[PDB]
Design a protein around this ligand. Structure first.
Ligand SMILES: *Cc1c(COP(=O)(O)O)cnc(C)c1O
Ligand SMILES: *Cc1c(COP(=O)(O)O)cnc(C)c1O
Ligand SMILES: *Cc1c(COP(=O)(O)O)cnc(C)c1O
Ligand SMILES: *Cc1c(COP(=O)(O)O)cnc(C)c1O
Lengths: 386, 386, 386, 386
C-alpha cells in the first residue's frame, strides 16, 4: 500500500518502484531518452528535460530511506554538494563548514565559493561551540560530514542542527560514508542530506553519481534552478537504473560490510605492529557513545596507523594480495590506500600532519569477502612491512 | 596513421578511436567503472575520477572534428556552457552575450551569473557594433550562438572573434545547431566551442550530454577546476559510448537532414498559407551570403509562420500525423512545435513578440524520413489549419 | 594469487575478475563488440565471435564457484540445457530424465528430442532404482533437477552419479534452484551443471541467461559445436556484465533468502489454515536428512497448500499487498503464484494432480524484504482467503 | 497512421515504434526485465518470458521493412537460421541447400542436421535446375543466400521460389548481405527471410543477433516451439534496443556503403595489379542483369584478386593503414580480410580452390569513410604488395 509503513529492508527493495503499469515489467524500465512527445498542443501547454521516470524512482526511493520529502539525482557526489550550495547561496552569503571534509568538497568551499563572493569559515565540527562562534548574520548554511576522514571523527548532528536553527541557518549533512541504512540525518534535525552514490548506495564500483534529499520546496529549487540554471548536473537514466539495482542489496551489503569491518578492526586493535585503529565500533573511539546513539551500525571504513611510518606503510600496501589499491570506498571489493605515499605524496609532511594524515596512516574500505581472508591478507602484509 | 590528415567522414568514423590494444575489440569498450586500481604505492603516487577511457575517445574525436586541441564531455549541454563560463569568470567579471540565445542559457546568464557577482550585457549579436559597444575593461567572454532561435538569424563568427580579441576577451560559440559537420567556429577564430550533444552529435534522441572543445590549457582548467570543483557535471561512460556510437553517422545524418530541410523549406516558401519561412538555405534569408561563407550546409532546422496566428498554429500541430510534437531537435524523427501555444503559452503576447515569437511561428526539426512523406504531412496539416 | 584457494565469499567477489591490465579499471569493462581486429595477416592466422572478454570473466567465475574446469554462458537457461544435450546426443541415443523437471525442459525432452531421434525415458528420480532400471545401452545422459518443482522433492546426486557412471552415462544436474552457494553437484560426482542465471545467480530480475559448467573437453565441444553449429545461443556481453554484477552479492543474498524462507516456512507450518508446507529446512520434509548432507542451506523457495482448494488459493493471491504475482523466482522481491488458477488453469484437474499440482498449492519465492513484513502480508491474505 | 503506407526511409525511422503511451518517451524504453507481474490470479490465467516490449518493436519494424507478417529476434544470425530450420524439420526430412553459403551455416547443415536424421543436399544454386534435380518427396526447405561468398555470385530468388513451391517446399533466404533496404526476398516469393543483424541491420559492430521474418503462423511456431523448446536463442532487450537504434540509419548507411563500394569497385577494376573484381554493380559481373532486377543497390561488399597470389595478398593486408583487418562485415569502418592467409590458412590449397577461395582473393567490407581515403589506402597497399 504505502512503502513508508514497511520495514527498512522492505523499503530498500520496493520504495519508489512498482511494476510498470502498461506492461507489468517488474524491473524499472530504462527510459534512456532525451525527447518526450506530446499528444496535442494543449498537452504541451499543460506540461509547461529535468525529469525522467527511471531517475524519479531512484529519487523517491532515497527520499523514503532518508525520511525526507523528495529526492534529486545528480551527475556526481560533488555535483550533489555544489548544486545544493549554489542553489542556497549568493554573493555576500556565508557558510560555516567542518574542516574534516572530503577533499573535492574542500576545494569548492575554499576557492570556488569565495570567487563567487560566498565566504566560508572552516571549523572543527567535533566542537559544536566552534560552529556557533563562527556564525554570522549572513550565514545561510552549516555544512558537516560524519564520520569524517581521515580518522573517522564524528559530528553530533542533533546538537549542530539545534545550533544552526537557532541562528537561522540550514544544516546540510554529507551522509555518504554511512548510507541511510546506518545514519539518518534528517531524523536528527538536518534539513538536507547529500550523498555520493558512487560509494555505498550504488555499491558496485561502476557508477559516479550523487543524490540530494530534503523538503519538496527546497528540492524543487535545486531541480528547477540549481540543475537547470547553474550546474547542469543531471544523472543519466542508465546510471539511475544501475543505482536502483545496486541499492536493492544496500541492507544486506551494509550488514556484511560492518560485520566484516568490526572483525577486522578488532584484529588490528590486537596487533602489536599497529599503533592506532580508528573505527566507531571500538570502545576506544573518542566519540564512541555519540556514535552508538547516532549510528545504527559503525560502518565499513577503518583507518589505522602501522608501526614504522612512511616506508612501512608503503611496504604494507605493496604486500597485500587480496586488498586492492584504490582511492574510492563502498565497493564490494576491499580497497586500501596509504595517503602519505599515494594521494598526499607531494604534500609537505608537516602540512599532512595538520590534516590528520600521519606517515603511517592506512585507510581501508572493507568489502564483502570472507573476513578471515581479509584478515589473513592484512596480517601477511603487516608482518612483512614491520 | 594520424586521423587529423584524413577526410572529414573518415575522421567522423575513426578519430579518437582504435581497436582495443589488449583484446582487439573494435568497438570502444564501455568502461562503466568508478574505481581505478593501482599496482603499487609508487604507481599511485605517479598517477597523482575526472577521466575515463570511453569518454576520452569521445573528447578526442570531437576535438579532431572541431579542429581544437582538446575536448571535455559533460552531463548536459547546459553543463558544458556553465562549466565553461564558471571556470573563466569570477565575481566582478563581465560577459557580453547575444540576446538570441537558447532558453536555459538565458536564465543562467540573466539570473545565476549576476547572483555570483558576474554581470552580463545582452546585445543583438547580428550587429557586431553592439558587441563592441558593450565591452568593458572587466569583459572576459563574448558569448554567441549561430544560427539562433527562433528565426535562425546568424552571427558573423570571424568578425565577432576579431572584435573580442582586440578588446582582450575570449569568444565562446554554442555550435549545437550546426554540429562540426556544418560549421567550425574555431577555424573562424573562436576560442571555445560548446555543444549540447543531446541534439545532432548524438542524434538518436536518447542521450543528454554536452561537450567543450578548445585549447589544452583551457580544457585542463575546465576539467580540473570547473568539473572537479564547481559543477561536478561529468558525463557517464555509457552516455559517452552512446554518443560515440551516434556520432559515427554524423556525416550521412547531417547530409540527409539538410537535403530534406532544403526540400521542405522550398515547399513551404511556395505555399500561399505560409507567410514567412526562415531557413539559411533560402536566398531570401536576411544573412544568406554570410551563411554561405560560414556554413558548409544550411542545417536541418526550419522556422515558419502560418497564416491565421495562434489558433491556426495550434490547429496545424494538432493535425500532423507523422511529425511528432516535441521541444527537442536533432533527432532522427521529424519534430515540430508551436511555441506560442506550447512552451510560451503563459507568456504575455507582446512579451513573446519582443522575443521574436509570433503567434503563428512553428519550429520544425527535420528528420531522416522520406521528404515526400514529411511534405505531404505538412501540407495535410496546413490545408486543414488554414 | 589464485582465487581457487580463497573462501567462498571471496571467490564470489573476485573469481574470474581482475583490474583491467591496460587501464586499471576495477569493474570488468563491457566489451559490447561484435568485431575483433587483427594487427597482421599472421595474427589472423594465429587466432584461427564465440568468445568475449566480459563473458569469459563470468564463465571463469562460475567455474570456480561450482568447482568445475570451465564455463559457458548462454542466451537462456533453456539454451544452457539444450546446448548441452544437443551437443552430447544424436539420433539413436537415449536420455533418462527425472519427471519432476521444470516445464520448458519437459517440452524439449518430451517432444523436441524424440523428433530428432533421441528417445527419453521419464522416471521418478527420488527413487534411484527407477533411474537404473531405465538405462539402456544407448543411454548417454541422466538428467536431474534438485530440489524439484512443485513440492521441492530432492534427488540424491552422489547416488545417482554413481549409478550413471557405472552404466557409462554422464550426469547433468540443473542447479538453478540452489545456486553454487547452496549446492555443488560436481563435488558430488555430477559431470555437468547447468543454470538459469535468470534466477538466483543474477538475482535482480533483469537478465535472461544460462550457464554450463564442466570439464574443459566437454565445454570446448559445447562452445565450438553446440553454440556455433546448433543453437547459436550466445549470451550478450551486457547481459554477462549484469550477471557478473548481480553475482557479486550472491552470498549475502542467498543467506538472506534462506534466513527469510526458514522464518516464513515455520510461520506457515504453525498456521491452522495451511494443510502442508514443503521446504527442505523443515524436519518434516520427506528427504530432510538427505538435504542436510547435500545442501549447505535449504534454499529460498517454499511451496504450501492452503485450506479450501482452488478458490481459496485464488482469493489468497488476490489478497497479498507486498508479494508480487509472477511466475519467476530468485529475485530480490518476494514472488508468489497459484499454479492451478494461473499457469495450469486450462489443464484438467486430474492431470494437474498427477503433476503434483493440487488445487490449493501456492509457490513462494522469498525475497530480501523484512521477514516480518512478508509474514504479515501472508497472514493477512491467508486470513481473508480462509 | 499506418507505417506500412509510408516511404521506406520513413518506415526505417518509425515502423514498430511509437512514443511510450504512459510517459511520452520518444525512445523505445529498454525493458531490461526478466519478470512480468500480474495484477490478479485472473490476469495471470488470461495471459496464459518469450516476448518483450523492446524486442517486439524491433520484430515489428523488420516485418514492415521485409513486407512480412511478423518478426522474431534471436541471439545470433546462426540462431535465426537454426531456430528456423529446427522448427520446420524433423528426423527423416530433407533440405536442399546452396553450396555457396556462409561458413557456420555450412557446419550446421553438413554435420549437425544429419546427426538429427535430417539430410541435406548441397547444390550450385546459381543453376536453378540443380535445385529442382535435388528435391525429394521428403524435402521441406530450399535454403539460399544471395549474394553469396566468396565471389558475390547470385541466386534468382523468384525463379527458385517457383521451383520450391511447385514441389511443395518452403524457400528460406538469408538476406544478411543485402539488408531489406537493398533486397526483399518475400516480395519475390520467398517464404521466410533470416538475417544476421550483426552485420548491416545493426551496422555498428557492437551487437551479435539475428532476426526471422515470415508468416504469423510460422513465426508463432518459431517462437513458441523453436525458441522455447529447442534453441533458447532469445535476444536480450538491450541488444534489441541497440539494434533498433542502429537500424534508424539503415537507409542513409546503405546508400553511403553502396556509393562508396561502387567507386572503390571501379577503381579496382581499373588497376593493372588487380586481376579480377567481384561486385554486382560492375557490368562485367556474370549475373549483372539479374542483380539489377532483384537488388535495388549493388551492396557494400567487394571481393577482388590481387596479382601474385598468397604472398601478395598477405603483403597487401599487412600494408593497409585505414582498412581494419577483421572477418565481420557491415560495420561503419571499412574491414578487409585475406582468407587464404587468415581464416583458411590451414586448409589445403586445392581444397580452398574448390570453395572459390583463390590464393590472391581479398574480401572488403566498405565502410562510411571518405571513398577517396579508402581508395588511397588500397592503392598504397596494392602498390607496395605488387
Ligand atoms: C566520494 C565522496 C564524495 C564525492 O563524490 P563523487 O561521486 O566522487 O563526486 C563526496 N563526499 C564523500 C564523503 C565521498 O566519500
Ligand atoms: C538543447 C540546447 C542546449 C541545452 O542542452 P542540454 O543537453 O539540453 O542541456 C543548449 N544550446 C542549444 C543551442 C540547444 O539546442
Ligand atoms: C527458470 C528455470 C529454467 C529456465 O531458464 P530460462 O533462463 O528462463 O530459460 C530452467 N530450469 C529451472 C530449474 C528454472 O527455474
Ligand atoms: C555473419 C553472417 C551470419 C552469422 O551471423 P551471426 O550473428 O554471426 O551468428 C550468417 N549469414 C551471413 C550471410 C552472415 O554474414
Amino acid at each position: 500500500s504505502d512503502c513508508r509503513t514497511y520495514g527498512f529492508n522492505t523499503q530498500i527493495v520496493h520504495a519508489g518502484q512498482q511494476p510498470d503499469p502498461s506492461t507489468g515489467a517488474l524491473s524499472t524500465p530504462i527510459f534512456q531518452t532525451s525527447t518526450f512527445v506530446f499528444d496535442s498542443a494543449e498537452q504541451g501547454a499543460a506540461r509547461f528535460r529535468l525529469g525522467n521516470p527511471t531517475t524519479d524512482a531512484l529519487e523517491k526511493k532515497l527520499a523514503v530511506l532518508e525520511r525526507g520529502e523528495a529526492g534529486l539525482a545528480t551527475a556526481s557526489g560533488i555535483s550533489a554538494i555544489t548544486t545544493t550550495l549554489l542553489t542556497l547561496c549568493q554573493q555576500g552569503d556565508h557558510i560555516v563548514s567542518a574542516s574534516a571534509i572530503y577533499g573535492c568538497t574542500h576545494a569548492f568551499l575554499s576557492h570556488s565559493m569565495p570567487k563567487f563572493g560566498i565566504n566560508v569559515s572552516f571549523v572543527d565540527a567535533a566542537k559544536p561551540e566552534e560552529i556557533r562562534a563562527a556564525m554570522r548574520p549572513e550565514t545561510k548554511v552549516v555544512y558537516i560530514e560524519t564520520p569524517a576522514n581521515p580518522t573517522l571523527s564524528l559530528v553530533d548532528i542533533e546538537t549542530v542542527a539545534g545550533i544552526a536553527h537557532q541562528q537561522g541557518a540550514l544544516l546540510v549533512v554529507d551522509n555518504t560514508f554511512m548510507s541511510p541504512y546506518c545514519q539518518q540525518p534528517l531524523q536528527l534535525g538536518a534539513d538536507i542530506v547529500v550523498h555520493s552514490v558512487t560509494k555505498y548506495i550504488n555499491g558496485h564500483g561502476d557508477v559516479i553519481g550523487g543524490i540530494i534529499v530534503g523538503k519538496q520546496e527546497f528540492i524543487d529549487q535545486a531541480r528547477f534552478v540549481g540543475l537547470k540554471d547553474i550546474t547542469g548536473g543531471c544523472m543519466s537514466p542508465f546510471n539511475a537504473w544501475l543505482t536502483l539495482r545496486g541499492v536493492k542489496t544496500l541492507g544486506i551489503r551494509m550488514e556484511r560490510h560492518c560485520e566484516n569491518a568490526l572483525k577486522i578492526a578488532r584484529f588490528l586493535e590486537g596487533h602489536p605492529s599497529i599503533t592506532r585503529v580508528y573505527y566507531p565500533g571500538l570502545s576506544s573511539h573518542p566519540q564512541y557513545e555519540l556514535g552508538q546513539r547516532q549510528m545504527s551500525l559503525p560502518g565499513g571504513i577503518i583507518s589505522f596507523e602501522i608501526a614504522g611510518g612512511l616506508e612501512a606503510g608503503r611496504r604494507m600496501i605493496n604486500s597485500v594480495e587480496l586488498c586492492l589499491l584504490a582511492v574510492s570506498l563502498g565497493d564490494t571489493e576491499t580497497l586500501i590506500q596509504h595517503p602519505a605515499s599515494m594521494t598526499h605524496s607531494p604534500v609537505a609532511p608537516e602540512e599532512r600532519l595538520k590534516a590528520g594524515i600521519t606517515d603511517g596512516l592506512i585507510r581501508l574500505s572493507v568489502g564483502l569477502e570472507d573476513p578471515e581472508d581479509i584478515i589473513n591478507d592484512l596480517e601477511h602484509a603487516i608482518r612483512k612491512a614491520t
